Design a protein around this nucleic acid. Structure first.
Lengths: 98, 97, 82, 62, 95, 82, 98
DNA sequence: ATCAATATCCACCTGCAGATTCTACCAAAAGTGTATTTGGAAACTGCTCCATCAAAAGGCATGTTCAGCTGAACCAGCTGAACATGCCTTTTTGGAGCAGTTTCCAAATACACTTTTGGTAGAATCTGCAGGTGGATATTGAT
DNA sequence: ATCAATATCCACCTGCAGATTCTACCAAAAGTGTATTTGGAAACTGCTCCATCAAAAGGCATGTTCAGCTGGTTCAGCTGAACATGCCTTTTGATGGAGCAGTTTCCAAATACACTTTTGGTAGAATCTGCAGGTGGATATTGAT
C-alpha cells in the first residue's frame, strides 16, 4: 500500500483550514456546554442562536491565538511538539492567570 | 488675596485608617496613591454603569447599575462583601429619613 | 452515555484548530488543558453575559450581551451588530 | 478599496468578510488599530513558520 | 413597526465611488458597521476625557483632531486629519 | 564625548533592573536590545504626552500628561496625582 | 585571596534590590534622553521634574516586567541566560509589536 | 568543618515628617415645585424550545511506522566577579512659562416649521457555487 | 539525491439557487429660520517652579584579568505521535408544532431635577511632637580550601 510520510497530511490540513474560515467545532455540543455552564449560574436561561455563534467565534479565535503562541514557545524550546507547559507559559505572559 | 482649592479624599482615608488600626499613620505619597486608586475605581464604575444604561435605553443610573457594575468589575467574595455593605447602607439610609 | 458534555469539544476539533494555529505536532495531554482553558474563558464571558442579561430583566441571552462581555474582556468581536 | 483588491485577487466580484480580514491583517496600520479585534468569519492569514515546512530535500530538482 | 438605523447606504455609496464593479455581502456590511461604531465610540470617549482634563465643557474639532493623533498611527492619521480639515473648511466656506 | 545619550542607560543599571527582575545570567547583546525597546516605549508615551501638551496650548510637560499617556497605553501609574 | 562562586553575589543583589524600591536609573541621563526625544517632536519644550520621575517609574516597571517574562522564557528553554530572542518573544506575545 | 565576610539585632539621638488645633468659606443639605421616568397591565406576535424523523459526515478504536524527545557526555567560549580608577552624579538665580481674574463676544443651544431621505415591502439578475470534464503540480519509492 | 510513477490541486465552463440589486411608500430625521444664552478667547497679573551649567566629593561606572560553569553540540535509544482503515455513532437538517417570552403600549404615581436658603465640613494656615532614619556597635548567618 501507498504510504505518505508523517507531516505531509498535517501540512495539507493546515493549508486547507488556513485557507478557509468555516467553524471547526460542532454546533450542538457547544450549545450544550454553554447551556450547562450558564445553568450553573442562573436556571432556565435561554440563548439566541447568533449569540452561540458569536461565542463560538470568540472561543475559536482565542484558542488558535493561544496555540500560535504555544507553537512559538515550542519552537523557541527547539521543539515541534506542543506541551502543557508551553500553553501555561503563553497564558501566563498574557496575564490569563486563572 | 488670590487662592485656589484642591479637594482630595485624604481625610476620609485617614479616618478609616484610624478606625481599623488606631496606632498607625500614612505618608503623603501613600495617601496620594490611595486617592488615585479611589478616583480610578470611581471612573471605572460610573463609565460602566453609563454604558449599561445606554444599552438598556435607560436615562437613570440606579443602585442596580452600581451593583451590576461592581459585579462585572469586582471578583467573587470581594464583590459579595462590597455588595452586602452597599445594600446595608442603602437600607440604613432609606429607613433613617 | 454522556461525560459532562465538555468532551464534545473533541480531540479532532482541537487538532483542526491547532492546525489553523499552525501546529504540526501535538502532545496528547494538550487536549484536556485546552478544554480547561476554554471553560475558564467561557465561564467569565458567560458570567458577564448573564449579568448584562440580569440587568435587562430578560430571560433570553442576546448577542449584544455577548458582545459587551467580550469587549470588557478586551476581546472585541465584529460582525454581530453593534 | 483593499477588500476589493483582495477580491480581484480571488477573482471575486462580491466583497466578503474574508477579504476584510485579509485586508486588515495585511496592513500594518490597520493591524495595529485592530490588533485586539475579532472579525467574525474572518479566519486567519496563511502564515506558516519557515521551520515547520519540509526540507530542501524535497525530491524534485527537475 | 420599529426602526433600526445603520450606515449601510453610506458604505454602499462609497463602494460605488471607489469600485463601481464590485458587491459586498450583508455580513461584511455588518462588519463595516461594527467597525464604524467602534471607532466612533473610541474617538468620542477620548475627546470627552481630554475636554474633562482641560476643564473644557465643549467638544470641538480640536479635540477630535487631537484624539485622532493619539489614536491613529503615522500616515493614516495625517491623511485623515488633512481630510477632516479640508471638510471643515469647505463647510465653513459654503454658508 | 557623548554618544547620542541613549548610552546613559548603562549596562550596570540594566543589570540592576534585571536582578530586580530576578535574572541571574545575562547575554551581552541584551543591553542594546533593551535600549531599543525602551526607546520605542518611551517614544510612544512621550509622543502622546506632547499631544496632550499641545492640546492644552502649554509649553511645559506636566505629570498629568504622562499619566494620561500611560493610561491610554494600558500602563496605569499610581502616586503622582489623578 | 578569598573568592565567592559565580551567582552568590548576583543573588544577594537580587535580594537587595527586590527588598528596596529606590530608582535604579540615573536621573540626569534620563532627563537628557527624554529631552532629546521630545525635542525631536517639538522644539524648546520643558518638563516638570515630577513628570520625569513618573516617566522613570513607568519605564523601570515596564522593563522589570519584560525581564521577568524573558526570564520565564529562558527557563522554559532550559536556560539561565537571557537572550534577545527571549525578549522578542515576550514582547511579541504581549503584542508590543513595534 | 569552621572563620571571614554578611546581614540581623540592638542602642540612641535627632528633625522633619507627619499628626493636630484654629479659621472661613465653599458646598452640602432643607425646602418648593415640576418635569421626566420607571414600573405595572394587558395585548400579542416572533422565536426559541423540543422532538422527531431521515442522511452523512465524521468520530473512534486498532494497529503499523518511524521520526521527534529526551538523556549522556563533553568542550569551549562566554559570562561572572575581584581590583583599579575616572569620571560623571550628586550637591551646593532669574525669568519662562503656569495658573488666576475680568469681560465681552462668537458660537452654541432652544423652539417652530418644513423638507428629504433613509427605513422598509416587494420585484428581479447575476454570480457563488455544486458539479463535470481536462491537465498540471506535489509526493513517494524505486531510480 | 532526485526520476519514473501517484495523485491532489487547478482550469474552466455551466446551470441555477439564491443572494443581491433595484423599485416603491411611509414617517421620522434632518434642516431652515429666529431668539436666547453662556463658554470661552483674549487681555493681564501673581507666582512658582524650572532652565541654567560651575565646581567639588565621592561613589558608581569602565575596564582588566582570571575562573568556572553552562550553553552549545553529538549520539543514541525509546516512546509518544502520526496516520490508514473499518466501522460505528452522533452530528446535521428539515420540519414542524407548543409554548414562552420579547415587545409594545397605555397610565398614574415615583423619582429625581431644578431653584432658593442656612448650615457646617473641609481646605488650608499654622503648631507641636514622635517615630523613621542615621549612625554606630555586638552578634547570629552563611559560604570555600
Amino acid at each position: 500500500p501507498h504510504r505518505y510520510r508523517p507531516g505531509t497530511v498535517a501540512l495539507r490540513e493546515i493549508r486547507r483550514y488556513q485557507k478557509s474560515t468555516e467553524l471547526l467545532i460542532r454546533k450542538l455540543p457547544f450549545q450544550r456546554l454553554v447551556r450547562e455552564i450558564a445553568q450553573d449560574f442562573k436556571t432556565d436561561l435561554r440563548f439566541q442562536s447568533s449569540a452561540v455563534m458569536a461565542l463560538q467565534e470568540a472561543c475559536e479565535a482565542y484558542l488558535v491565538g493561544l496555540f500560535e503562541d504555544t507553537n512559538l514557545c515550542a519552537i523557541h524550546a527547539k521543539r515541534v511538539t506542543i506541551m502543557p507547559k508551553d500553553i501555561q507559559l503563553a497564558r501566563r505572559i498574557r496575564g490569563e492567570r486563572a | 488675596r488670590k487662592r485656589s482649592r484642591k479637594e482630595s479624599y485624604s481625610i476620609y482615608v485617614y479616618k478609616v485608617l484610624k478606625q481599623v488600626h488606631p496606632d498607625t499613620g500614612i505618608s503623603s505619597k501613600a495617601m496620594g496613591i490611595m486617592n488615585s486608586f479611589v478616583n480610578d475605581i470611581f471612573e471605572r464604575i460610573a463609565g460602566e454603569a453609563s454604558r449599561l444604561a445606554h444599552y438598556n435605553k435607560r436615562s437613570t443610573i440606579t443602585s442596580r447599575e452600581i451593583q451590576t457594575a461592581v459585579r462585572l468589575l469586582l471578583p467573587g467574595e470581594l464583590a459579595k462583601h462590597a455588595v452586602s455593605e452597599g445594600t446595608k447602607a442603602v437600607t440604613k439610609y432609606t429607613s433613617a429619613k | 452515555v454522556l461525560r459532562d458534555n465538555i468532551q464534545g469539544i473533541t480531540k479532532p476539533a482541537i487538532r483542526r484548530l491547532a492546525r489553523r494555529g499552525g501546529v504540526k505536532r501535538i502532545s496528547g495531554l494538550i487536549y484536556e488543558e485546552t478544554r480547561g482553558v476554554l471553560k475558564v474563558f467561557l465561564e467569565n464571558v458567560i458570567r458577564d453575559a448573564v449579568t448584562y442579561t440580569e440587568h435587562a430583566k430578560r430571560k433570553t441571552v442576546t448577542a449584544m450581551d455577548v458582545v459587551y462581555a467580550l469587549k470588557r474582556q478586551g476581546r472585541t468581536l465584529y460582525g454581530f451588530g453593534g | 478599496e483593499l477588500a476589493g483588491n483582495a477580491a480581484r485577487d480571488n477573482k471575486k466580484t462580491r466583497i466578503i468578510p474574508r477579504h476584510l480580514q485579509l485586508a486588515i491583517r495585511n496592513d500594518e496600520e490597520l493591524n495595529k488599530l485592530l490588533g485586539r479585534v475579532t472579525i467574525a468569519q474572518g479566519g486567519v492569514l496563511p502564515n506558516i513558520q519557515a521551520v515547520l515546512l519540509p526540507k530542501k530535500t524535497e525530491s524534485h530538482h527537475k
